[PDB]
Design an enzyme around this catalytic site. Structure first.
Site, PDB file in Angstrom:
ATOM      1  N   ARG A  12      21.989   2.641 -33.895  1.00 28.63           N
ATOM      2  CA  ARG A  12      22.513   1.358 -33.416  1.00 28.63           C
ATOM      3  C   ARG A  12      23.127   0.537 -34.545  1.00 28.63           C
ATOM      4  O   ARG A  12      22.427   0.098 -35.454  1.00 28.63           O
ATOM      5  CB  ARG A  12      21.405   0.561 -32.701  1.00 28.63           C
ATOM      6  CG  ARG A  12      21.246   0.927 -31.230  1.00 28.63           C
ATOM      7  CD  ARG A  12      19.939   0.473 -30.599  1.00 28.63           C
ATOM      8  NE  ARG A  12      19.567   1.428 -29.556  1.00 28.63           N
ATOM      9  CZ  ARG A  12      19.550   1.195 -28.241  1.00 28.63           C
ATOM     10  NH1 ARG A  12      19.842  -0.003 -27.746  1.00 28.63           N
ATOM     11  NH2 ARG A  12      19.217   2.180 -27.410  1.00 28.63           N
ATOM     12  N   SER A 100      25.212   0.212 -25.907  1.00 27.29           N
ATOM     13  CA  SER A 100      24.320  -0.118 -24.772  1.00 27.29           C
ATOM     14  C   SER A 100      24.622  -1.460 -24.069  1.00 27.29           C
ATOM     15  O   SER A 100      25.698  -1.631 -23.492  1.00 27.29           O
ATOM     16  CB  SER A 100      22.804   0.076 -25.122  1.00 27.29           C
ATOM     17  OG  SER A 100      22.024   0.486 -23.965  1.00 27.29           O
ATOM     18  N   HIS A 101      23.679  -2.398 -24.131  1.00 24.75           N
ATOM     19  CA  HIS A 101      23.774  -3.699 -23.452  1.00 24.75           C
ATOM     20  C   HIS A 101      24.148  -4.829 -24.424  1.00 24.75           C
ATOM     21  O   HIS A 101      24.190  -6.005 -24.042  1.00 24.75           O
ATOM     22  CB  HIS A 101      22.429  -4.023 -22.793  1.00 24.75           C
ATOM     23  CG  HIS A 101      21.335  -4.317 -23.776  1.00 24.75           C
ATOM     24  ND1 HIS A 101      20.601  -3.327 -24.394  1.00 24.75           N
ATOM     25  CD2 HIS A 101      20.870  -5.492 -24.268  1.00 24.75           C
ATOM     26  CE1 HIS A 101      19.725  -3.877 -25.219  1.00 24.75           C
ATOM     27  NE2 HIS A 101      19.868  -5.190 -25.162  1.00 24.75           N
ATOM     28  N   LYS A 110      23.797   7.765 -28.896  1.00 25.25           N
ATOM     29  CA  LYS A 110      22.679   8.421 -28.235  1.00 25.25           C
ATOM     30  C   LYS A 110      22.909   9.938 -28.294  1.00 25.25           C
ATOM     31  O   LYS A 110      23.993  10.435 -27.960  1.00 25.25           O
ATOM     32  CB  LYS A 110      22.522   7.891 -26.812  1.00 25.25           C
ATOM     33  CG  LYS A 110      21.994   6.455 -26.796  1.00 25.25           C
ATOM     34  CD  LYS A 110      22.270   5.709 -25.500  1.00 25.25           C
ATOM     35  CE  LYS A 110      21.639   4.320 -25.554  1.00 25.25           C
ATOM     36  NZ  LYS A 110      21.870   3.489 -24.332  1.00 25.25           N
ATOM     37  N   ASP A 234      24.097  -2.101 -16.733  1.00 27.27           N
ATOM     38  CA  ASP A 234      24.277  -2.475 -18.131  1.00 27.27           C
ATOM     39  C   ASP A 234      25.524  -1.836 -18.695  1.00 27.27           C
ATOM     40  O   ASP A 234      26.131  -0.977 -18.045  1.00 27.27           O
ATOM     41  CB  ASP A 234      23.041  -2.127 -18.974  1.00 27.27           C
ATOM     42  CG  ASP A 234      22.983  -0.673 -19.378  1.00 27.27           C
ATOM     43  OD1 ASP A 234      23.427   0.203 -18.608  1.00 27.27           O
ATOM     44  OD2 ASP A 234      22.451  -0.399 -20.470  1.00 27.27           O
ATOM     45  N   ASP A 236      26.497   0.588 -20.629  1.00 34.16           N
ATOM     46  CA  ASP A 236      26.782   2.026 -20.620  1.00 34.16           C
ATOM     47  C   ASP A 236      26.303   2.750 -19.357  1.00 34.16           C
ATOM     48  O   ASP A 236      26.530   3.956 -19.209  1.00 34.16           O
ATOM     49  CB  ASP A 236      26.267   2.702 -21.905  1.00 34.16           C
ATOM     50  CG  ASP A 236      24.756   2.528 -22.128  1.00 34.16           C
ATOM     51  OD1 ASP A 236      24.150   1.576 -21.597  1.00 34.16           O
ATOM     52  OD2 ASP A 236      24.174   3.345 -22.872  1.00 34.16           O
ATOM     53  N   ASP A 238      23.135   3.222 -18.059  1.00 39.84           N
ATOM     54  CA  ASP A 238      21.835   3.896 -18.022  1.00 39.84           C
ATOM     55  C   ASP A 238      20.708   2.981 -17.534  1.00 39.84           C
ATOM     56  O   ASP A 238      19.575   3.428 -17.349  1.00 39.84           O
ATOM     57  CB  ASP A 238      21.500   4.599 -19.351  1.00 39.84           C
ATOM     58  CG  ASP A 238      21.457   3.660 -20.540  1.00 39.84           C
ATOM     59  OD1 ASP A 238      21.661   2.433 -20.378  1.00 39.84           O
ATOM     60  OD2 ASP A 238      21.204   4.166 -21.660  1.00 39.84           O
ATOM     61  N   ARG A 239      21.039   1.711 -17.297  1.00 39.85           N
ATOM     62  CA  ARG A 239      20.099   0.742 -16.727  1.00 39.85           C
ATOM     63  C   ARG A 239      20.623   0.162 -15.410  1.00 39.85           C
ATOM     64  O   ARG A 239      21.828  -0.101 -15.271  1.00 39.85           O
ATOM     65  CB  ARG A 239      19.849  -0.401 -17.698  1.00 39.85           C
ATOM     66  CG  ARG A 239      19.313   0.034 -19.032  1.00 39.85           C
ATOM     67  CD  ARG A 239      18.319  -0.963 -19.568  1.00 39.85           C
ATOM     68  NE  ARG A 239      18.806  -2.333 -19.557  1.00 39.85           N
ATOM     69  CZ  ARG A 239      19.430  -2.907 -20.584  1.00 39.85           C
ATOM     70  NH1 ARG A 239      19.656  -2.219 -21.698  1.00 39.85           N
ATOM     71  NH2 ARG A 239      19.837  -4.167 -20.495  1.00 39.85           N
ATOM     72  N   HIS A 321      15.625   1.601 -17.176  1.00 33.96           N
ATOM     73  CA  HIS A 321      15.930   3.016 -17.280  1.00 33.96           C
ATOM     74  C   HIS A 321      15.093   3.728 -16.239  1.00 33.96           C
ATOM     75  O   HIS A 321      13.872   3.513 -16.166  1.00 33.96           O
ATOM     76  CB  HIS A 321      15.605   3.558 -18.667  1.00 33.96           C
ATOM     77  CG  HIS A 321      16.509   3.054 -19.745  1.00 33.96           C
ATOM     78  ND1 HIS A 321      17.554   3.800 -20.251  1.00 33.96           N
ATOM     79  CD2 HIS A 321      16.519   1.882 -20.421  1.00 33.96           C
ATOM     80  CE1 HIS A 321      18.170   3.106 -21.193  1.00 33.96           C
ATOM     81  NE2 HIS A 321      17.563   1.939 -21.315  1.00 33.96           N
TER      82      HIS A 321
HETATM   83  O1  LIG Z   1      10.967  -3.289 -27.193  1.00 30.70           O
HETATM   84  P1  LIG Z   1      12.038  -2.194 -27.639  1.00 30.70           P
HETATM   85  O2  LIG Z   1      11.313  -1.004 -28.403  1.00 30.70           O
HETATM   86  O3  LIG Z   1      13.086  -2.910 -28.588  1.00 30.70           O
HETATM   87  O4  LIG Z   1      12.724  -1.605 -26.323  1.00 30.70           O
HETATM   88  C1  LIG Z   1      14.023  -1.941 -25.860  1.00 30.70           C
HETATM   89  O5  LIG Z   1      14.786  -0.906 -26.462  1.00 30.70           O
HETATM   90  C2  LIG Z   1      15.163   0.101 -25.521  1.00 30.70           C
HETATM   91  C3  LIG Z   1      16.668   0.299 -25.524  1.00 30.70           C
HETATM   92  O6  LIG Z   1      16.916   1.678 -25.257  1.00 30.70           O
HETATM   93  C4  LIG Z   1      14.660  -0.335 -24.161  1.00 30.70           C
HETATM   94  O7  LIG Z   1      13.692   0.624 -23.783  1.00 30.70           O
HETATM   95  C5  LIG Z   1      13.979  -1.677 -24.367  1.00 30.70           C
HETATM   96  O8  LIG Z   1      12.664  -1.709 -23.818  1.00 30.70           O
HETATM   97 ZN   LIG Z   2      22.153   0.976 -21.554  1.00 27.84          ZN
END
Ligand SMILES: O=P(O)(O)O[C@H]1O[C@H](CO)[C@@H](O)[C@H]1O
Ligand SMILES: [Zn+2]
Length: 455
Positions: A12, A100-101, A110, A234, A236, A238-239, A321
């Site tokens: 990321r 992602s978001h 990913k 979201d 991409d 996946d949510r 997810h």
């Molecule tokens: O609390 P963290 O580990 O940052 O989790 C956040 O990060 C992930 C993004 O893929 C999601 O599963 C979200 O719950």
């Molecule tokens: Zn996503």
């Protein structure tokens, strides 16, 4: 390359700051080398609708090509469509270039190698390959592959809606707008699009259905148009976020209750996975149907690994997810999950509100965040795992500390995206909710009395 972009679940970055064209090349080199080390020369590559997508993906492709890899270029696709590629094409490897978001300047990767979505020390291994120069060199290739129309048909041909439905669809200007309103319509729905134009600027609202303010527009639109349901995706894809005909936000742990009932009815004894952020009511509901409830770690990659380990037919996370293995491939897919939700809701005579309110509720807090440091967050957890006293409860330490009491539960764990402690509480009563919060507040203060506890 900065070492902070190499995260527990994936890579990321912030483009310009912590991520450049050159590092995306070197990440491409590392991923090809791991794929070849596992016997997989074929890698699929997709990108989302971010502004930096076209720039970084040619670099990613070039890195993979420079290992001797045979690259299948799927172009701009939702994240799950990339995962689909790495399931149906020649290779079992794939990289998704997505942020992602997150805000516009973010991007990342990913990664699936030889069927397995990389996590923890495997992400780190990629970084160490570059530093060591433990990298393959070859003359690879790139084939253009139009995969979206095949993904589309795969879902359409397996989903059987029992009645027509009217759905508001909010793609938050992400990449789900490439397929989601089209596909949902093909299932026998009327679709009201919101922010379905792919715009990497995100001029309207961040494509993050995990936050309630990013569902305001969707909720009003559902009510205004007398839609049977509202859906949010979201960045991409996946949510998924779910809203009822009367505007009630359906959190993914209660969404997973409906799916579990569904999956388990055709599959007696099926293992069902949920993360530590999910209501305890899932455990009971899954057991009630003869399922085997498996609590696991937050994070898409960890969940997918857990699914192969257990042979679970379904998994869900509190973030949105949702992973179907039954009738599917076992990767998180907001678009496929929406399709599964719509199939189930169409088979019922009641509206979505009443379908979902049939299930038990407990007084719930929103996810709480305390900002600490990257170099303290795991140590705080370890101190709590070493020293803490929780009273009578079932103590789980698989990810932070969760304690299930007879009348509620509390959680504290370290984020794998931010320097924060993530907390959640649930109970039968305000009294019990307060008791659990006080338990956790006191254990946190006992580790570090200066910790800012906002409960
Ligand atoms: O609390 P963290 O580990 O940052 O989790 C956040 O990060 C992930 C993004 O893929 C999601 O599963 C979200 O719950
Ligand atoms: Zn996503």
């Amino acid at each position: 390359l900065p070492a902070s972009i190499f995260r527990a679940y994936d890579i990321r970055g912030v483009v310009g700051d912590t991520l450049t064209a050159e590092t995306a090349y070197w990440i491409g080199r590392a991923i090809g080398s791991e794929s070849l080390a596992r016997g997989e020369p074929c890698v699929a590559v997709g990108r989302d609708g971010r502004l930096s997508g076209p720039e970084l993906v040619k670099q990613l492709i070039q890195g993979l090509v420079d290992c001797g890899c045979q690259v299948s270029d799927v172009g701009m696709v939702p994240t799950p469509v990339l995962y689909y590629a790495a399931n149906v094409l020649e290779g079992k490897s794939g990289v998704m270039l997505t942020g992602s978001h997150n805000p516009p300047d973010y991007n990342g990767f990913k990664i699936v190698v030889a069927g397995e979505t990389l996590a923890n020390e495997q992400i780190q291994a990629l970084r160490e390959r570059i530093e060591k120069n433990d990298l393959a060199s070859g003359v690879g290739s790139v084939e253009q592959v139009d995969i979206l129309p095949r993904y589309f048909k795969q879902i359409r041909d397996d989903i059987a809606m029992a009645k027509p439905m009217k759905v508001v669809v909010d793609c938050g200007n992400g990449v789900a707008g490439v397929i989601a309103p089209q596909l949902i319509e093909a299932l026998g729905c009327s679709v009201i699009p919101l922010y379905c134009e792919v715009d990497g600027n995100f001029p309207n609202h961040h494509p993050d259905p995990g936050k309630p303010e990013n569902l305001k527009d969707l909720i009003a639109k559902v009510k205004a148009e007398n839609a049977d349901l509202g859906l949010a995706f979201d960045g991409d894809g996946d949510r998924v976020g779910v809203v009822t005909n009367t505007g009630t936000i359906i959190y993914p742990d209660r969404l997973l209750m409906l799916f579990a009932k569904d999956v388990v009815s055709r599959n007696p004894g099926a293992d069902i996975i949920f993360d530590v952020k999910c209501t305890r009511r899932l455990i009971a509901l899954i057991s009630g149907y003869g399922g085997r409830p498996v609590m696991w770690k937050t994070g898409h990659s960890l969940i997918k690994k857990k699914m192969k380990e257990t042979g679970a037919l379904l998994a869900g996370e509190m973030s949105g997810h949702v992973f179907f293995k039954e009738r599917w491939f076992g990767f998180d897919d907001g678009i496929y999950s929406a399709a599964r939700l719509l199939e189930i809701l169409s088979q019922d005579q009641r509206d979505s509100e009443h379908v979902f309110s049939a299930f038990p509720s407990d007084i719930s807090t929103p996810e709480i965040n305390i900002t600490v440091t990257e170099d303290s967050k795991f140590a705080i957890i370890e101190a709590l795992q070493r020293d803490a006293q929780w009273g009578e409860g079932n103590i789980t330490t698989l990810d932070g500390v969760r304690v299930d009491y007879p009348k509620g539960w509390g959680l504290v764990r370290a984020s794998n995206t931010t320097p924060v402690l993530v907390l959640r509480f649930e109970a039968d009563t305000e009294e019990e909710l307060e008791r659990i919060k006080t338990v956790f507040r006191n254990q946190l203060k006992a580790v570090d009395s200066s910790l800012p506890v906002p409960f």
